[PDB]
Amino acid sequence: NYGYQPLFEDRRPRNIGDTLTIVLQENVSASKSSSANASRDGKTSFGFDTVPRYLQGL
Amino acid sequence: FGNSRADMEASGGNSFNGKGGANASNTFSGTLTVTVDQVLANGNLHVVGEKQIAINQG
């Protein structure tokens, strides 16, 4: 005797020793990315090509 | 104005260019079955879960 068995219920595992089908379908995907930047450019100039007389000493 | 006493010529320049930036991103896709290990005072459920997969060499 295997005990009471439901008639219309779907066949499910209920006790120790019962079998069950596992459909292994795994799809995992993780990603991450980052960046940082900094820039600085500086140019400066001053030139006196021709200096008038009253400015010579300066 | 004789003897180039007032003749003069000057030039000058100043330049500055700074810039910066940053960016971050992250994606995650998958499915995981977790278990409830606590029920809070308002009915919210604390859930924890772990999946371990070993394929060949790790």
Numbering used by the authors:
A (entry chain A): 59 to 116
B (entry chain B): 117 to 174
Could you share sentences copied from the article?
The bacterial flagellar motor is a huge bidirectional rotary nanomachine that drives rotation of the flagellum for bacterial motility. The cytoplasmic C ring of the flagellar motor functions as the switch complex for the rotational direction switching from counterclockwise to clockwise. The basal body is made up of the LP ring, MS ring, C ring, rod and export apparatus. Here, we present two high-resolution cryo-electron microscopy structures of the C ring-containing flagellar basal body–hook complex from Salmonella Typhimurium, which are in the default counterclockwise state and in a constitutively active CheY mutant-induced clockwise state, respectively.
